[PDB]
Amino acid sequence: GIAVSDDCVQKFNELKLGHQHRYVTFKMNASNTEVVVEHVGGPNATYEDFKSQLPERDCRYAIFDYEFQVDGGQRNKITFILWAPDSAPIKSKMMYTSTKDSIKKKLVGIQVEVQATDAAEISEDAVSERAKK
């Protein structure tokens, strides 16, 4: 069973507790034995900084601290994202789907979950719609 590295939780806690990162992405390590931190986005990194780097033919996990306004007040939603494009190899989708429960349960405090399989499903409009639901 693929493990989740401690650093994943550390970076997540930095985002969740310290508001230190706008987002963190995660990927399987070279040996497919552990989930590891891939990218760390600074507090002022944009939704596009995150989305533009997702691989067309591989899967990723991510946490995005999604900020929006409701009636002029600020809100945030810790959003977990499974990026699993249809064009990824079946092996890869298999690995990331079957490990999804393990990583989510270690990242305590997720408020919103999104599973995206194509460009429209990972659009900011899609995440935003799900975050203020």
Domain ranges of the chain: 1-133
- Closest by Cα among 4, 30, 12, 16 to 100: 4
The C-alpha atoms of residue 115 and residue 128 are separated, in whole angstroms, by 13
SS (H, E, C) 17-72: CCCCCCEEEEEECCCCCEEEEEEEECCCCCHHHHHCCCCCCCCEEEEEEEEEEECC
Phi, psi of 126 (to 5 degrees): -70, -45
Cα-Cα end-to-end distance for the chain:
34
This PDB structure is determined at a resolution in Å of 1.6
